[PDB]
Each structure stands twice: as structure tokens, then as C-alpha cells.
Amino acid sequence: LTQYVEGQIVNRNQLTLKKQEDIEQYVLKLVRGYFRTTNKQGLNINSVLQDHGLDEFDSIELAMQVEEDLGYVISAETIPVLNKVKHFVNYINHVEQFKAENGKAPIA
Amino acid sequence: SLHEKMQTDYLWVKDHSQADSWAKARTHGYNYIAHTVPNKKERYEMIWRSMGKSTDWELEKFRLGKKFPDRGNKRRWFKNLFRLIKNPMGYIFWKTYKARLAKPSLIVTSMFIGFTLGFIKLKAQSIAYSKKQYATLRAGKNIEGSGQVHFGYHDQKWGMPAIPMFQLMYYELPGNSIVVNPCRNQNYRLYFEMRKKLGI
Amino acid sequence: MKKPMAKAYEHPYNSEHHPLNFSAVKIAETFHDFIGPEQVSPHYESFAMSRKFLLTFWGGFFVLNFGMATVDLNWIMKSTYIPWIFWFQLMYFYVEGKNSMFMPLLQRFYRRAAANEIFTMEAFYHENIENKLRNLMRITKGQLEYWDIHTSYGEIRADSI
Amino acid sequence: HGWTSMLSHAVLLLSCYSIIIMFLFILGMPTLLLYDFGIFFLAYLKGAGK
Amino acid sequence: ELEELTETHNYIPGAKDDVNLRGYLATQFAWGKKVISFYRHPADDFKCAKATKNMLGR
Amino acid sequence: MNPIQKAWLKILEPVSYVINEKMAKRTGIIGKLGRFFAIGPREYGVHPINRMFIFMNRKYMAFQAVALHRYSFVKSLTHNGFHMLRVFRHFAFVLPATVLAGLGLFVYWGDDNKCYSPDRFPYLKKRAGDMALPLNSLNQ
Amino acid sequence: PQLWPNPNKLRFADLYKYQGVEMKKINDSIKNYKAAKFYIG
Amino acid sequence: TLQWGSLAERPMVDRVMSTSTWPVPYYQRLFKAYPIREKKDKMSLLLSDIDIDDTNWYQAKDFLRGSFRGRQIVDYVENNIASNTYILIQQDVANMAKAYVHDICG
Amino acid sequence: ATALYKSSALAGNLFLYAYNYNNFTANIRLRTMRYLFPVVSLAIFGNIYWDYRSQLVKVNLFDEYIQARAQELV
Amino acid sequence: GYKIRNKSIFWTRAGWKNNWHPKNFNAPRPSYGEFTMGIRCRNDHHSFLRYVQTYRNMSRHCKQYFLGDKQLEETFILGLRSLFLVPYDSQCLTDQIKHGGERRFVDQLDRDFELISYNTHPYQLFTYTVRNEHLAWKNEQYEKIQKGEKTFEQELLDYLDEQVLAEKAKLRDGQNFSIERMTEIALHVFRKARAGKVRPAQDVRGPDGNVNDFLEQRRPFEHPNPTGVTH
């Protein structure tokens, strides 16, 4: 549960959003933090990642960071469909709703 | 760098003679002359120019002065012999680099190695035959002449021609295949029976 | 200045004298340590031509040494006759006969001609790479012209008023 | 084979073994190919029956 | 990069080079003039085999 | 410079003082003799035999890495991993087995190391002073 | 820079504690010898 | 020519001097000696003719962030510039001229 | 002398592995040597020690027989 | 310079500069369903998702040994993308490769990740060495700045700033200080500084045609026997 951060071991924390407004604010902060993202302030809920300097491989790095913060296990079949900010928000809702009903994480 | 002077001195040998420290003994190039190079006559002109500048083109001074050998070439054959013993493969590699720039075909290289190793193989058999003649001499047969190329009325055996035809039909006698008969091991039956008789 | 990291990861099974992975470069380094540096002669004449008489003595000494030692030298000469005739008549065409008979077999020449051209390309490496940069530098200089125009707008706006 | 003249008492030792190696592994190439075809291997060779 | 070609057993010269210019210089007069295909590994084998109604899979 | 050369220095420390400080600068012949047998860093002190091993070890190891790094014959039998048609899969373990057999290259060198030499004919010639004997000497 | 070791102008104590590129290779080989104690053992 | 002399004097014909010195050392140097495998302070010569790419703006930010003015430039560009890439290429003066007519009205 | 040479040659293999420990251990391309080096080394030691041990038993049987048989003939 | 003169240099039996589908006898041919009994083929439609998972594996398994170095992670990402963007930008028509270019590259990248998972890939060992040499130099600068001392890089920057003032104060006729003139000022200082350092000889030949090595000592012979160590 611990990771190196600039040569120092730091305890990593996990997030539990469970709310639509918390999901949108997290995803926006997630994409803005990525070093390849352009026009960070022009980024809105309906922003296409291709319009901000992101390609299919940058979506993998973004999804890899979601598994770090939220603790998800996202399969490789789902990653290539995450091409908008809206897609990350709807996917996070689908995972939390799936775990609230099925009592287990989605298939990985 | 830091370890350059130490490592360069450790890797290679330098010249310890101070032959050229003496001014008048320095050669003009007339001691070891190249005879067949295409610029041969340009070498002689430079030697003549060196002799003329030393005497201000009054060569009578050279005739009256003493002539010296090339002291820088002293003990050069010994120095190459010591480098050959120090690193034989490194000496051979660099002395043959210019010659090995032209590489003959795989066929020619194989012919060189084949005939060379084949000649050494015949030499080894010739040495072994000399030991046979020494054993024959000690066994009581005096030997006139030498070798196995019988001049008289005897059969000769020339040695296997180093071509695949004879190398498929014949092969040399391997001495390690001549063994003591395994019936020798049956004498150990005497030991097993003796041990039981003695209650061992 | 922010304090940087103390060090990166240090691999426990990789060293300079014992590199973990293999290539011809490390083998080339150990090869030249073995054969040593290029044995540069400092003299005015080569060693063979200066000692022709002496090397001829030692050349014939070992010939006589082998000749005096080999008492059955005639048996070796006769034993070598058959393979000498056989291998030379068999490989004559592939070595020499092809140069004036049925087929040239220029495969080995094609390898010399390609390598001779690469020798020239390496000799002109600095020239060819410098011409390629002249076009990239031209593109870079063209993009830097927009900043030169902008730096004069403040002077233009002031002089226009 | 000239460089192997002193490696044994037979100059053609490596050639005599290689001709057997060449025979065995070439003989096994068709056998492994039929194994790759599977149980249908006969249909790959002759085709459909009549 | 030379160690990467060796450790992955990509020992076909010029396989990962987009323009194997050395491969073209070596085959200027070769029979069946061809250069290695891009990123060809010496171990991969894409051979197939089919059984048809005719012989030899035709 | 190696530990064996440094061990010689501590033993020859007083000898180096007599040669380098006293003899190497006294005068005349004693000076020339002391400057010739001076003690210090070995000029041309590299050991080519050490270097011959390092080169040949590295070159033979790169060959071991290639011959031992093969795709498995067993894994290709099911046609479910990476190999559908491999008509020469039965050659996959020849090079690995050949490199592993090279470990006994020096252990079994010559005839004496592959058998019990006293039961062979060549042993009798060595005990006879490397002398030729009749081929049936082991029987008589 | 000017204090770099010279094979001619060298002290006895400096040569004994030189520790050059030859020793750096050996120290790497020694690390392999020590790490192989359990395997060889 | 193809007739250069005897075999013993073959290594003699190779040397070509740039000075007038006599006698001339015959040996023609083949390579440069490389006794110590030292890591060169020189940058790699592979970085020769690579076109513009992502490493140019990534290193520009790293060197700009070493200054106070550069830190302001980087922050404003990555936040308040509507561009789909950091590889900025000026192919027209549309954004420049329209920024001047919207400014000189005062 | 044979048993001593083959023991020194086997010791040479252990040095070859130790001198190249990092490559034989960390490089997966040499995994087969790392795995099967101890199996081959045990077989080599097995042959060396088997030959020495069997030779030693045969010498003891010979020595004890010539002494027992000599006393009977006396 | 020198240009290839053979106009047919890039000609192959399959076309100009064709390194995607070389011409061979056993050419691919179609299969007809109604006439095919059985088939043995290894091709599938799994390369796309395998390409995505391989990128995630190579990225995440390499970041294990970065010690949280954020700049190194971002630099490694740029390098990792350059490895995966090869088939998308190459001159070679990767979509026309003989037996499926997608499968070929995915299997090729899997061999790289296998080495990466063991932390033995040469790109990894090269990254640790390059980063250690870089951080050692950054730590040297940090220790000099904490001590109030001026770094060698700041001395040149300060020295180059006063050179531009001196040149633009004497160049009053023209007032266009181009980047060409700015460059040759720095290069004149860089050459003088590089020649000042005690560096190993990089060029083959010095001012004369002779080589700059320790082996380039010819006659005249003027060196005595080597002297021993002093006590």
C-alpha cells in the first residue's frame, strides 16, 4: 500500500467518490495533472481528450492512474473506449453501481 | 585522464635508449636504405640534402669527419623476440594486419589449414616410427639407413592420402582401444571366496 | 534550487567489467585488451628489411633444424603427392579458373564493392549529416521569425502614438 | 573439414556424424508435419474420399 | 540497442530498421533480390495448412 | 596493479630503498645497474593469458546465451502457445544439450580421462620410458 | 589534475595504495565470487 | 601503380607526412588507441537530425522552470491556450494580427 | 593423477560459474545452465569418485588376498 | 558529400523499397469455405487488446524501479511511446505486412516485456546509469549553491551576458543581433573552455597529421630507462 515518491516511501490513500460531483471533480483533476494535457482550463465535462493532446496510449496512462487512486482493476477491453472526460465519469459510476448490486468488482 | 599515464605505461613498452641524444651520431638515413620503393630516388635526395645541410654543402667536412652507424637499431632483433614471447598472439595479429586485409576464400583458407595440419600429422607418425626403430634396435636388429621407404625388395606403406576417399576406407590404429582382456576381472572370484572362508 | 533525488536505482547484478547483457562491443573491448595496443614502430625502417640477412639465417636454421630432425622426410613428400594433386585440380576452377572460364562467380566481389562504397560513406559522414541539418536549421530559423516581429510591436505601438 | 584434422583419429568424424544427423531430422520433418495436421492428416494429403 | 537485438534474439540484421540501407547495398546483385521484412523475428512461423476436397490442399 | 604485486612491494620495501635511493643514483656502473633493476610500476606488466581468458570467456558466453535460449519443444506440442507448425521442433534441445556437454570438455580430455588407463596399451609405453612395444604386450 | 599519479614520479606508499582501473575490475569479480557462495556450496 | 617493390619493403610505401622531416618514421597508424573505456563528457552524436517532437517542449518547460519568467510562461501556456498539442508551429499570422487589432484600439 | 586432474577441471567449472555469477543468475537466456549446472557437476563428481572408490576397493581385495594366500603356502 | 549513385538501390522483386511483403514462391492464397475440410492457423483477432495490455505492463513494471522520480517517469513515457508508435509512422506499410503486421509487433513487444519483468532489459539498465550520472551532477550543483559558491554553468552564463553587452555596445550601425551571432559568441567560449580542460584526446589527429595517442612516439629516441618509486 506504500509507494516511493521522490525517493521517499509514502503511504498511499484510496478514494471513495460515490457521488456525481466528486467524480467529475476527480476526473478533471486527473486529466489536468497529466503532463501531456493541453488547455487545462478549457477542459470541461464534454471535452474530447484528442482535443487536448491525448491519444490512445495516454488514455492507458490515465486509466492506470485511476487504478492507483480508486483501487479499480480495469481490463484492457475497457481502456480503448475511454476517449472523453464524460467516458471516465460514466465508467466510474458503472463500477460503483455494479459493486453495489452484484457485491463484487467487475470482471478483469 | 586520472589513470591514463599509469595504464598506458602498464600496457605497452617504450624505448629506453637515448641513441639520438647525441647530435653528431644521428643518422642521415644511409645505414638502412629502402632499395625497391617507387620513391627510392627521393629517399637518396633527402639523404644527400641532410648531408649537405650538416656541412653547409662542403662535403669535404663529411669526408674528414667520423661516420657512425645507426645506434637506434641496436638490439632490435632481441627486442622483437621479447615482445613475441611476452604476447605472441598480439605480436602476430598486428604484424599481419595489413596482410590480413586481403582475405582469401574459404577454400584457400581450408587448404592452408588442411595441408598444414596434414603435414604435422605425418610428422607425428614419422616420430612414432622412429621409436619403433629404436625398439627394434634394442631388440637386437642393427639398422642400416633409416626411414620406411625401402630401397630393396620390401613392401612400403606411404601413409594415408589426405583425401576423403582413403579417409573413409581407412583409419589409424587407436592405441587406447587395445585393452586387457576382461577375463582378468574373473580372478576377483578368488577374493570373494577367500573372504567367506576366513569369515570376513 | 530544489534538492534533487540522492540517487536512482542501482542494479545489483550489472557492472562495467561484468555487464549483464551481451553485445559485440564488450567482446571487442576484451579482445583489444588481449591483443594489446597497436604495436607502433618508432623506427625509420621496418624490422624485416633491416634484418634480412639475419632473418634469412634463422629462417634457414629452422628449415635445417626440421630437416635434420626429420629423418623420414622422403616418406612425407611422397605421402603428400596424392592430396596435393587432388585438392588443387578439384578447387582450381572455384579459386582461379572462374576468372577466365565458364562462369565468373562474382559473389565475393559484390561484397567487396558494397564495403568499398560504405567506406566512402563513412568517410563523408560529417558532410552528409551537415547537409541534412542545413534543411532543419532552415525550418527552425523560419519559425523564429515570428518572435522577432512580436518584439517590435511595443515600439511600433509607441511610435504610432 | 580441414580444421578438424587433429581433433580425432578420423578426419571425417564430424562429416560422418552429420550425414546421420541430416538423415534423422529430415526423416522427422514429415512425421512432425502430420502430427501438426492432426487426425485429419489424410485429408491434407489426398483430399476427399471417393 | 544492440543488446536489445541480442537479448530478444533479433539476430537478423536490419529487421528492426525502417530503411535497411545496409541490406539494399548487400543485395544489389543478389538472386531473388529482397530485404528482410520489417520486424521479422527468426523464430516466428506463420505457416498454415488446410485440407480441401482436392489433393495437396488445393 | 593487483594484490600479488602489492604483496611483493611490502616484502621488497627495504630492497627498493637500497636500489632506488642508494644504487640508482650513486655513480657510473652502480648507477646504471640500479636504474635497470629499479622497483616500481611494471612497464608492460599486462598478463596476456589473463586477457586471453577474459576475451574467450565472454565470446563463448554470448554463444551459450543463444544456444540455451530456445523455444520449448514441449510447449509447441499443444498448438496453443506461439507455435502452430514447427516441423523442426525436435531440434530445439540439441544446442542446449551440446553446450551442457561442453562442461566436461576439460574434465574428459585425452584418453586417460575417459577410462581406466592402466588397462590400456598406451599406459604400458609410458611406464616403459615412452618406448614402442608389441601390440600384445598387455597379454604376455 | 597535476596531482594525477605518474609511473615515474611516484612514491612507494602511493603505488601500494594506487587502486586503479585494474583493481576496479577485480573488485567486481570478487563481488561475483562472494555472491556465488551458496550456489557453489 | 601495381609494382611497389619487394615484399620486405612493402610497409614502407604507406606513410605520407605533412612536414618536411627526415628521416621519416615509416609506420602508418591504423586506428586511434583507446586504452581506457572512459565515459565521454561529449553528448551523443545520435542526436543529429531528429525532427521536432515532444522532447523539445518537455525540455523547454524544464529549462524555463529554472527562471521566474519561464515559470509564468509555462503555467499560462498549459492552462490558457486552446491548442491540441504542445508542438506549436506558426504557419500563419492569424493569431498574431488579430491580437494586435484587439489591442491597439486604445 | 587422473582423479586429481578431473577434480581440478571440475573446480575450474565452479570458477567459471562464480566468475560469471551475475550473468548465469540474472540473465534468463542462461537459465538452463543455472538450472542444470549442478546436475552435470554431480554426475562429473559421481564419475570421479566412483572410479576412485572402486579402484580403492579392488586394491584392498588384492592386498588382503596375497597376504592370506602366502601364509597358506608357507 | 557523397550520394548513392545506383538508381536501382531500393528496387526489390516486390517493388520499390518493399520491406513489408517480399516476393517469395509460396505466396498467400485465399481459402473457400465450401471446399475446405479443416485448417490449422494461428492467426486471431487478439493483437489489439494485447497491444494495450503490453503497454500497461511495460509502463507499470518499469516504474517499479524509478523510486518515484516524476521527471524520470514522464521521460520514460515519452520513450515508451516512441517504441509503440513505430508501426504507425514508419515508411514501411505495416498494414500490408506478409502475414499480419499487428500480430508480429505484439509478439515482438512481448519478448521485450519478459525482459522488463525480470529487470534485465538493456533499456532499463541504460536508464539507471543515465539517471545516476545526471543526479550526481545535479547534486554537485546543489552543494555549490548551498555554500554560496557560483556553479560553472552560472559563470559561463554571466560571462556570456557581458559579451553580448560588449558586442551590442560597439555595433551601433546595425541593431539586429541575430541568433547566428549570438551562437558564435557562445561557441567561441565553449571551444576555449573545452580546450582548457584536461580531457582525453577525442580527435584522431592533432594539429599535425600525427595521432594524439600515447603510442605516437617515434624517433628521435630521447627517453632514458624508467625510474622507480621514491621513498
Ligand SMILES: CCCCCCCCCCCCCCCCCC(=O)OC[C@H](COP(=O)([O-])OCC(O)COP(=O)([O-])OC[C@@H](COC(=O)CCCCCCCCCCCCCCCCC)OC(=O)CCCCCCCCCCCCCCCCC)OC(=O)CCCCCCCCCCCCCCCCC
Ligand atoms: C684468461 C681467462 C679469461 C679468458 C677470457 C676469454 C674470452 C674473452 C672475454 C671477452 C670477449 C669479447 C671481448 C670484448 C668485446 C667487446 C665488444 C663490444 O664493445 O660490444 C659489442 C657488442 C655490441 O652489441 P650492441 O651494439 O649493443 O647490439 C648488437 C647489434 O645491435 C645487433 O643487435 P640485433 O638485435 O640486430 O641482433 C643481432 C645480433 C644477435 O642476434 C642473433 O641472432 C644472435 C642470437 C644469439 C642468441 C640465440 C642463440 C641460439 C641458441 C639459444 C636459443 C635462444 C632461444 C630463445 C627463444 C626461446 C625459443 C623461442 O647479432 C650479433 O651477433 C651481435 C653480437 C656482437 C657482434 C660481434 C660480431 C657477431 C658475429 C658473430 C656471430 C656469432 C656469435 C653470435 C653470439 C651472439 C651473442 C649475443 O656487445 C657485446 O658483444 C657484449 C659482449 C660483452 C659481454 C661481456 C661478458 C663478460 C665477459 C667475460 C665472460 C666470461 C666467459 C668465459 C668463457 C669461458 C670459455 C668457454
Ligand SMILES: CCCCCCCCCCCCCCCCCC(=O)OC[C@H](COP(=O)([O-])OCC(O)COP(=O)([O-])OC[C@@H](COC(=O)CCCCCCCCCCCCCCCCC)OC(=O)CCCCCCCCCCCCCCCCC)OC(=O)CCCCCCCCCCCCCCCCC
Ligand atoms: C614461399 C616461397 C618459397 C620460400 C622462400 C622464401 C621466400 C621469402 C618470402 C617468405 C616470407 C613470406 C612467406 C609468404 C607469406 C605470404 C605472402 C604474404 O604475406 O602476402 C600477403 C597475403 C595476402 O595475399 P594477397 O596476394 O595480397 O591477396 C590474396 C587475396 O585474398 C586473394 O588472392 P587470389 O584471389 O588471387 O588467390 C587466392 C590465394 C592464392 O591461392 C593460393 O595461395 C593457394 C594456397 C593453397 C594452399 C597452399 C598450402 C601451402 C602448403 C603448406 C603445407 C605444408 C607445407 C609442406 C607440405 C606441402 C609440400 C609442398 O591468395 C593467397 O593465398 C595469396 C598467397 C599466395 C602466395 C603464397 C602461397 C604460399 C604457399 C606455399 C607454397 C609452397 C611451399 C612449400 C613448403 C616448403 C617447405 C619446405 O597474406 C595472406 O593472407 C595469404 C597468406 C595465407 C593466409 C591464408 C589464411 C591463413 C589463416 C590461418 C588461420 C589459422 C592460424 C591460427 C593461428 C596459429 C596459432 C597462433
Ligand SMILES: CCCCCCCCCCCCCCCCCC(=O)OC[C@H](COP(=O)([O-])OCC(O)COP(=O)([O-])OC[C@@H](COC(=O)CCCCCCCCCCCCCCCCC)OC(=O)CCCCCCCCCCCCCCCCC)OC(=O)CCCCCCCCCCCCCCCCC
Ligand atoms: C533458405 C535458404 C537456405 C538456408 C540459408 C541459411 C544459411 C545461413 C548462412 C550463414 C553463413 C554461416 C555463418 C557462419 C560462417 C562464418 C565462418 C565461415 O565459415 O565463413 C567463411 C568465410 C566466407 O567465405 P567466402 O570466401 O566469402 O565464400 C562464401 C561462399 O562460399 C560464397 O562464395 P562463392 O560464391 O564464391 O562460392 C562458390 C560456391 C559454388 O558452389 C556451387 O556452385 C555448388 C556447390 C555444390 C556442392 C557440391 C557438394 C558435393 C558433396 C560431395 C560429398 C562427398 C563426400 C561426403 C562424405 C560424407 C560421408 C559419406 O562454391 C564454394 O566455394 C562454396 C564454399 C564452401 C561451401 C561449404 C558448404 C557447402 C554446402 C552448404 C550447405 C548449406 C545448404 C543450404 C541449402 C542451399 C540450397 C540452395 O570465409 C572464411 O573462410 C573465413 C572464416 C574462416 C573459416 C575457416 C574454417 C571453416 C570452419 C569453421 C566455420 C564456422 C563453423 C562451421 C559453419 C559452416 C561452415 C561450413
Ligand SMILES: CCCCCCCCCCCCCCCCCC(=O)OC[C@H](COP(=O)([O-])OCC(O)COP(=O)([O-])OC[C@@H](COC(=O)CCCCCCCCCCCCCCCCC)OC(=O)CCCCCCCCCCCCCCCCC)OC(=O)CCCCCCCCCCCCCCCCC
Ligand atoms: C516401427 C515404427 C513404425 C511407426 C513410425 C512412427 C511412430 C509413431 C509416432 C507418430 C506420432 C504418434 C503420436 C501421436 C500423438 C497423438 C496424441 C493425441 O492423441 O492427440 C489427439 C490427436 C487428435 O486431435 P486433433 O487432430 O488435433 O483434433 C481432433 C478433433 O478435435 C476431434 O474432432 P471430433 O470430436 O469430431 O472427432 C471425433 C473422433 C472420431 O474418432 C473415431 O473415428 C471413432 C472410431 C470408432 C470408435 C469405436 C466406436 C464404437 C461404437 C460402439 C457403439 C455402442 C453404442 C451401441 C448402442 C447403445 C447401447 C445402449 O475423433 C477423435 O476424437 C479421435 C482422434 C484421436 C484418435 C487417436 C489417434 C492416435 C492413435 C494412435 C494409436 C497408436 C499409437 C501408438 C503410439 C505408442 C507410443 C509410441 O491425434 C492426432 O493428432 C493423430 C495425429 C497422427 C499423425 C501422425 C501420423 C504419422 C504417420 C505414421 C505412419 C507412417 C508410415 C510411414 C513411415 C515411414 C518411415 C518413417
Ligand SMILES: CCCCCCCCCCCCCCCCCC(=O)OC[C@H](COP(=O)([O-])OCC(O)COP(=O)([O-])OC[C@@H](COC(=O)CCCCCCCCCCCCCCCCC)OC(=O)CCCCCCCCCCCCCCCCC)OC(=O)CCCCCCCCCCCCCCCCC
Ligand atoms: C522424488 C524427488 C522429489 C520429487 C518432488 C519434487 C520434484 C517435482 C518436479 C520438479 C520439477 C521437475 C522438472 C521437470 C518437470 C517440469 C514440469 C514443467 O512444466 O516444465 C515445463 C518446461 C517448460 O519449458 P521451458 O522452460 O521453456 O524449457 C524447458 C527446457 O529448457 C527444455 O525444454 P524442451 O521442450 O526444448 O526439451 C525437449 C526435450 C526434453 O528432454 C527430455 O524430456 C528427455 C526426453 C527423453 C525421452 C524422450 C521419449 C521419446 C518417446 C518415448 C516413448 C516411450 C517411453 C518409454 C520410456 C522407457 C524408458 C526406458 O525433449 C526433446 O528433445 C524432444 C526430441 C527428442 C529427440 C528424439 C528422440 C525421440 C525418438 C526416439 C526414437 C528412439 C527409439 C525408437 C524405437 C522405440 C522402441 C520401439 O519444459 C520441460 O519439460 C522442462 C524439462 C526440464 C528437464 C527436467 C529434467 C532435468 C534432468 C534431471 C535428471 C533426469 C530426469 C529426467 C530423465 C528422463 C528420462 C530420460
Ligand SMILES: CCCCCCCCCCCCCCCCCC(=O)OC[C@H](COP(=O)([O-])OCC[N+](C)(C)C)OC(=O)CCCCCCCCCCCCCCCCC
Ligand atoms: C559457407 C559455409 C556455410 C554455408 C551455409 C550456406 C550458405 C548459403 C548462402 C545463401 C544461399 C541460399 C540460396 C537460397 C535461394 C536464393 C535464390 C532465390 O531466392 O531464388 C530466386 C529465383 C531467382 O530469381 P531472381 O530474380 O532473384 O534471380 C534471377 C537470376 N538471374 C539474374 C540470372 C536472371 O527465383 C525463384 O523464385 C526460384 C526459387 C527456387 C528455390 C531454390 C532454393 C530452394 C532451397 C532453399 C531452401 C533450403 C533450406 C534448407 C534448410 C535445411 C535445414 C535442414
Ligand SMILES: COC1=C(OC)C(=O)C(C/C=C(\C)CC/C=C(\C)CC/C=C(\C)CC/C=C(\C)CC/C=C(\C)CC/C=C(/C)CC/C=C(\C)CCC=C(C)C)=C(C)C1=O
Ligand atoms: C561455465 O560456462 C563456461 C564458460 O563461462 C561462460 C567459459 O568461459 C568456457 C571457456 C573456457 C575458458 C575460456 C578457459 C580456457 C582455459 C583452459 C583451456 C586451460 C587454462 C590453463 C592455464 C591458464 C594454464 C595454467 C597453468 C597451470 C595451471 C600449470 C601450473 C600450475 C599452476 C600455475 C597452479 C599450481 C597448482 C595449484 C594446485 C596451486 C593453485 C594456485 C593458486 C590458487 C594461486 C592463486 C593466488 C591467488 C592470490 C588467487 C566454457 C568451456 C564453459 O563451459
